[PDB]
Amino acid sequence: MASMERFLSVYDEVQAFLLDQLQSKYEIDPNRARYLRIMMDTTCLGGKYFRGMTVVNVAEGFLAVTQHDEATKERILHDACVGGWMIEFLQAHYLVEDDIMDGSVMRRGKPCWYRFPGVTTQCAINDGIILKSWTQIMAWHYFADRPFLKDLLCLFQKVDYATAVGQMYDVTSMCDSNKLDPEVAQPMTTDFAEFTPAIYKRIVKYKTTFYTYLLPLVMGLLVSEAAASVEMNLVERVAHLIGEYFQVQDDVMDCFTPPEQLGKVGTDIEDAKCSWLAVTFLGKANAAQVAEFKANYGEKDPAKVAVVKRLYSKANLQADFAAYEAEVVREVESLIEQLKVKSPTFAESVAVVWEKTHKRKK
Amino acid sequence: MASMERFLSVYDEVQAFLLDQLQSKYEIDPNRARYLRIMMDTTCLGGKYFRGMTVVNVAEGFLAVTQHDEATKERILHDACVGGWMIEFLQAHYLVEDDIMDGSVMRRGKPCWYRFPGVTTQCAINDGIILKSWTQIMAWHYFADRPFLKDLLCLFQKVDYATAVGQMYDVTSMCDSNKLDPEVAQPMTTDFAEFTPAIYKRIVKYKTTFYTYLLPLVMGLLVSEAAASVEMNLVERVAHLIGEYFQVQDDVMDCFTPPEQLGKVGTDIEDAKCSWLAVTFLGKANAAQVAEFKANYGEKDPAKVAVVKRLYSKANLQADFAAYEAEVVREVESLIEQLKVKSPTFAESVAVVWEKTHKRKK
Ligand SMILES: COCC(=O)N[C@H](C)c1ccccc1
Ligand SMILES: COCC(=O)N[C@H](C)c1ccccc1
Ligand SMILES: COCC(=O)N[C@H](C)c1ccccc1
Ligand SMILES: COCC(=O)N[C@H](C)c1ccccc1
Ligand SMILES: [Zn+2]
Ligand SMILES: [Zn+2]
Ligand SMILES: [Zn+2]
Ligand SMILES: [Zn+2]
């Protein structure tokens, strides 16, 4: 069976499980089950499934080099698919809550879930809560007798918690740290002193890299009982590195990819986000460029946003991006080598992960 | 050491642990740690700690009848306090998210967390996420080598998930089930056909009774290694029964307790909630009373809300409440007896829990 078809089939199976349980254990009625069914489909389906499929790809790579009964290959691939949907549903929780937090309009060419007419914020906050709760129900049911259950639960919770802390770093990135204060309404920075490469790197490490790259790779090792084929410090290192590059790409597209192709109107500038573009611009600007940036960044006025886009265009940030890219190519290729000492297989999976990111066009 | 002082001391210990970890593992800076510290204090402290202290009370009752080394008594009471704060922090997650969902203003005489000037909804949704994440970090750290760790994690997740499903039942209780539909903006019921005792009971069972009464009692059994001193079906039965009574009290106070003493302006009527008062009123009203209720319920207009309060007052709902109360006194006293077959101790703890609820004046 082809991996994607397996993956999709298990979605159906998990969905039926979750909704049937609601009916047998939680007294749900047909109409609320249907609401939840729709919510699950709308919030979990329609992406590329890169995260979830990476768990399956990692587990297929070990199946090719490890001796097992056919029924054990099937059980490993079924566990890889369940674990991959745990990650997809965890992403769906974060996207639904993030979209409400940020006042987002669209995602992927469709309205954000909270904007659906019959959802509203009052239901959507709780729908997002439920999405994450469903990851736990999956694990306790499908993995109940598995040796990896503790490790997988403990990894998932650390990853979830990192991601929430990253969300906190992201949404406070345009404030001065020393002025954070629940009692006092928060002004936008005026100095941009915290728009640095290391502070950027912190935000991105936590907000995206743990759930997007670290979790899929490590979940694939866990469902395969293969965590001894790797040096975990290397897998963390490469995950964080590739995931940073991924976010840098996102940041560039937020500004420059036209909305119809982006699936969104990008507002990082108006939102005063600490984006790769802002940090890299500041890192090369002269005094007058810095002043013009300060006078225009973090405002809804479209003329001011255009002045920012103009400044970035004139600043030849494509060049700094090519330099960044070269350096990441270099470091990721080194880490893949350190990963071969223990597993060619695991290294190849990391190689694919890299190729898909590096060569992604959307 | 007195139980409450122990309990409070462990708060300090857990808080320090959580913030120190943020600094050693998650790259936090001092100012964001301080933000989180304040958020934890504001959202977790200032109640009666009834839920968390019930875990400690249940564990103290078993200590009086079970032989242990002093160091084991201390470890049990420390685990009971950690487990009690897991429950308090889980409540704090639900209160912060519920207040945003419902557009609440105050809680306990202070602004809701999201309304603080330097919080805002964008941070508060994620702060609530973090609150629940902290319950997991507590458990994996304090209970890492404990025999009850799996059982406690599995119970906590089922309770969390029930509570979210209860939130869904609560916020959709004024819509017709057969019209739920993410695509279509939801009208208020006009028939009130779903304002029934059984539908009420479902809402309350899930929204409040699992986290408020079932979880504290069962966590106390788990940290004591005492789940064989009970028949779990009875503990579930009594938890749900007492927790229903608790909510009925809340519902009555929402309408009739003056705001300064309530800590809140009550809006259940304007919000068209399926409250005990509405269900009980409908269950005794004549045709003209039902019509007047329909014409006035679920509106912000204060004249219409006063017409509802008037209808409830004239309807002698104190009498139906006394009848309800008598019946609950009767059934809870029976369950306490079935609970004595296996544990006098556990029965007494349930007795205290009941007394505190029955005789609570706030
Ligand atoms: C829609 O964008 C076209 C496009 O090639 N996007 C990819 C993802 C990309 C690569 C490198 C830097 C920025 C963006
Ligand atoms: C690929 O995105 C659309 C786009 O026009 N990007 C431009 C060429 C760019 C700017 C800054 C950094 C990298 C690339
Ligand atoms: C502030 O309310 C006074 C008061 O006694 N409240 C308690 C909680 C109560 C008991 C029974 C029914 C309703 C309310
Ligand atoms: C105790 O709350 C304040 C209050 O005036 N309550 C009244 C007496 C009441 C109405 C309906 C049901 C029970 C009690
Ligand atoms: Zn965001
Ligand atoms: Zn972006
Ligand atoms: Zn609510
Ligand atoms: Zn209430």
Side-chain angles (χ1 to χ4, degrees):
Chain A
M1 178 170 200
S3 295
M4 175 68 65
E5 298 157 20
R6 191 186 292 272
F7 189 75
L8 302 172
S9 300
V10 168
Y11 179 83
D12 290 350
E13 176 195 347
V14 171
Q15 176 173 89
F17 170 80
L18 290 169
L19 298 174
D20 289 356
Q21 186 186 257
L22 278 158
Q23 182 216 79
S24 70
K25 303 220 178 342
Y26 290 86
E27 298 172 28
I28 213 167
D29 58 282
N31 284 291
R32 282 176 183 74
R34 172 172 57 73
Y35 177 105
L36 290 170
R37 187 170 60 61
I38 299 166
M39 185 272 285
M40 192 190 302
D41 291 348
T42 308
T43 62
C44 296
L45 297 178
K48 298 190 255 179
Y49 311 115
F50 160 82
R51 296 164 186 76
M53 283 297 298
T54 295
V55 189
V56 175
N57 294 337
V58 166
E60 287 167 331
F62 284 103
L63 289 179
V65 298
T66 308
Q67 303 196 312
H68 296 301
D69 284 347
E70 185 63 27
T72 299
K73 300 179 205 197
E74 289 293 312
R75 174 203 93 209
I76 288 171
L77 289 168
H78 189 279
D79 284 355
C81 286
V82 172
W85 278 116
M86 289 178 64
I87 306 176
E88 289 295 321
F89 278 48
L90 182 65
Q91 174 171 59
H93 161 80
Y94 281 114
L95 305 178
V96 163
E97 307 291 2
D98 191 58
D99 288 341
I100 293 159
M101 285 181 297
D102 299 347
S104 308
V105 185
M106 307 281 272
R107 182 167 281 286
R108 264 205 250 96
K110 289 174 41 181
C112 299
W113 175 245
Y114 75 98
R115 299 187 50 254
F116 277 50
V119 177
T120 80
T121 301
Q122 180 176 45
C123 288
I125 295 173
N126 196 69
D127 289 345
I129 289 168
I130 288 171
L131 281 161
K132 188 162 72 189
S133 197
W134 279 338
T135 69
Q136 304 305 286
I137 300 305
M138 289 175 213
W140 280 99
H141 176 70
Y142 289 104
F143 311 150
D145 65 31
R146 295 289 192 274
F148 54 77
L149 175 61
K150 190 177 179 188
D151 285 344
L152 188 156
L153 297 169
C154 171
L155 167 65
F156 200 87
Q157 194 272 145
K158 282 174 192 173
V159 167
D160 178 33
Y161 185 53
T163 303
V165 174
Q167 278 287 83
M168 186 195 186
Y169 292 156
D170 197 46
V171 299
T172 62
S173 63
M174 72 289 307
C175 290
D176 296 343
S177 298
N178 61 304
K179 291 299 215 65
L180 296 167
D181 185 341
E183 298 290 318
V184 177
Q186 294 287 297
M188 177 166 47
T189 187
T190 57
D191 70 12
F192 292 91
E194 295 173 64
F195 276 42
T196 65
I199 288 163
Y200 179 79
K201 291 186 201 144
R202 184 186 69 166
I203 291 168
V204 171
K205 178 181 185 190
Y206 290 90
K207 86 152 160 195
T208 341
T209 74
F210 283 91
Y211 88 90
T212 298
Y213 293 94
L214 188 49
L215 185 59
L217 286 170
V218 183
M219 198 175 282
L221 295 168
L222 294 178
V223 302
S224 296
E225 299 284 352
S229 304
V230 309
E231 188 75 58
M232 194 63 70
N233 283 337
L234 294 175
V235 175
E236 292 186 21
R237 287 166 47 200
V238 83
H240 295 315
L241 183 61
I242 303 176
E244 183 187 291
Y245 183 89
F246 172 83
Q247 186 61 55
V248 170
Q249 288 172 317
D250 175 315
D251 287 1
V252 168
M253 293 191 294
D254 194 272
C255 194
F256 291 115
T257 301
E260 69 277 21
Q261 205 174 321
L262 187 66
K264 264 215 303 199
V265 175
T267 54
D268 285 355
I269 298 165
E270 293 95 320
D271 295 341
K273 301 311 292 287
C274 180
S275 70
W276 179 83
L277 293 166
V279 171
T280 301
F281 177 82
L282 291 174
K284 72 195 298 204
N286 63 26
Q289 277 158 352
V290 169
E292 191 169 0
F293 176 96
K294 288 172 177 181
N296 286 280
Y297 202 65
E299 306 282 308
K300 272 86 208 335
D301 179 341
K304 291 187 187 185
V305 170
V307 166
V308 179
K309 294 205 188 186
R310 186 76 44 114
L311 284 176
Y312 290 171
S313 306
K314 287 185 215 136
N316 195 207
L317 300 181
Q318 301 75 18
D320 303 82
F321 178 79
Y324 172 73
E325 183 180 3
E327 184 56 25
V328 175
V329 174
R330 171 175 169 92
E331 287 180 303
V332 172
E333 296 188 346
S334 174
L335 285 164
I336 292 172
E337 303 283 298
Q338 292 283 14
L339 281 166
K340 287 169 171 166
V341 173
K342 284 178 181 208
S343 181
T345 292
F346 183 69
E348 177 55 19
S349 296
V350 173
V352 172
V353 160
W354 173 237
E355 302 171 41
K356 281 146 176 214
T357 306
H358 188 213
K359 91 197 146 49
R360 90 196 173 94
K361 302 259 209 260
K362 136 88 145 284
Chain B
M1 178 170 200
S3 295
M4 175 68 65
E5 298 157 20
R6 191 186 292 272
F7 189 75
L8 302 172
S9 300
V10 168
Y11 179 83
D12 290 350
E13 176 195 347
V14 171
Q15 176 173 89
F17 170 80
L18 290 169
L19 298 174
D20 289 356
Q21 186 186 257
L22 278 158
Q23 182 216 79
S24 70
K25 303 220 178 342
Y26 290 86
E27 298 172 28
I28 213 167
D29 58 282
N31 284 291
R32 282 176 183 74
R34 172 172 57 73
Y35 177 105
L36 290 170
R37 187 170 60 61
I38 299 166
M39 185 272 285
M40 192 190 302
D41 291 348
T42 308
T43 62
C44 296
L45 297 178
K48 298 190 255 179
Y49 311 115
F50 160 82
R51 296 164 186 76
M53 283 297 298
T54 295
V55 189
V56 175
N57 294 337
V58 166
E60 287 167 331
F62 284 103
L63 289 179
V65 298
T66 308
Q67 303 197 312
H68 296 301
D69 284 347
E70 185 63 27
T72 299
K73 300 179 205 197
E74 289 293 312
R75 174 203 93 209
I76 288 171
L77 289 168
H78 189 279
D79 284 355
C81 286
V82 172
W85 278 116
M86 289 178 64
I87 306 176
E88 289 295 321
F89 278 48
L90 182 65
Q91 174 171 59
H93 161 80
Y94 281 114
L95 305 178
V96 163
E97 307 291 2
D98 191 58
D99 288 341
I100 293 159
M101 285 181 297
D102 299 347
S104 308
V105 185
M106 307 281 272
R107 182 167 281 286
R108 264 205 250 96
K110 289 174 41 181
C112 299
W113 175 245
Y114 75 98
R115 299 187 50 254
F116 277 50
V119 177
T120 80
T121 301
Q122 180 176 45
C123 288
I125 295 173
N126 196 69
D127 289 345
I129 289 168
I130 288 171
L131 281 161
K132 188 162 72 189
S133 197
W134 279 338
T135 69
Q136 304 305 286
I137 300 305
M138 289 175 213
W140 280 99
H141 176 70
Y142 289 104
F143 311 150
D145 65 31
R146 295 289 192 274
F148 54 77
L149 175 61
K150 190 177 179 188
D151 285 344
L152 188 156
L153 297 169
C154 171
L155 167 65
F156 200 87
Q157 194 272 145
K158 282 174 192 173
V159 167
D160 178 33
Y161 185 53
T163 303
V165 174
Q167 278 287 83
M168 186 195 186
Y169 292 156
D170 197 46
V171 299
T172 62
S173 63
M174 72 289 307
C175 290
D176 296 343
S177 298
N178 61 304
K179 291 299 215 65
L180 296 167
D181 185 341
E183 298 290 318
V184 177
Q186 294 287 297
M188 177 166 47
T189 187
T190 57
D191 70 12
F192 292 91
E194 295 173 64
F195 276 42
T196 65
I199 288 163
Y200 179 79
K201 291 186 201 144
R202 184 186 69 166
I203 291 168
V204 171
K205 178 181 185 190
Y206 290 90
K207 86 152 160 195
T208 341
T209 74
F210 283 91
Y211 88 90
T212 298
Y213 293 94
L214 188 49
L215 185 59
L217 286 170
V218 183
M219 198 175 282
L221 295 168
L222 294 178
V223 302
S224 296
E225 299 284 352
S229 304
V230 309
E231 188 75 58
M232 194 63 70
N233 283 337
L234 294 175
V235 175
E236 292 186 21
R237 287 166 47 200
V238 83
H240 295 315
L241 183 61
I242 303 176
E244 183 187 291
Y245 183 89
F246 172 83
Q247 186 61 55
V248 170
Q249 288 172 317
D250 175 315
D251 287 1
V252 168
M253 293 191 294
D254 194 272
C255 194
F256 291 115
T257 301
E260 69 277 21
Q261 205 174 321
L262 187 66
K264 264 215 303 199
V265 175
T267 54
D268 285 355
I269 298 165
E270 293 95 320
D271 295 341
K273 301 311 292 287
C274 180
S275 70
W276 179 83
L277 293 166
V279 171
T280 301
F281 177 82
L282 291 174
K284 72 195 298 204
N286 63 26
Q289 277 158 352
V290 169
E292 191 169 0
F293 176 96
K294 288 172 177 181
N296 286 280
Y297 202 65
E299 306 282 308
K300 272 86 208 335
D301 179 341
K304 291 187 187 185
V305 170
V307 166
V308 179
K309 294 205 188 186
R310 186 76 44 114
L311 284 176
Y312 290 171
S313 306
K314 287 185 215 136
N316 195 207
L317 300 181
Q318 301 75 18
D320 303 82
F321 178 79
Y324 172 73
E325 183 180 3
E327 184 56 25
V328 175
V329 174
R330 171 175 169 92
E331 287 180 303
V332 172
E333 296 188 346
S334 174
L335 285 164
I336 292 172
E337 303 283 298
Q338 292 283 14
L339 281 166
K340 287 169 171 166
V341 173
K342 284 178 181 208
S343 181
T345 292
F346 183 69
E348 177 55 19
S349 296
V350 173
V352 172
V353 160
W354 173 237
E355 302 171 41
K356 281 146 176 214
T357 306
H358 188 213
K359 91 197 146 49
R360 90 196 173 94
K361 302 259 209 260
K362 136 88 145 284

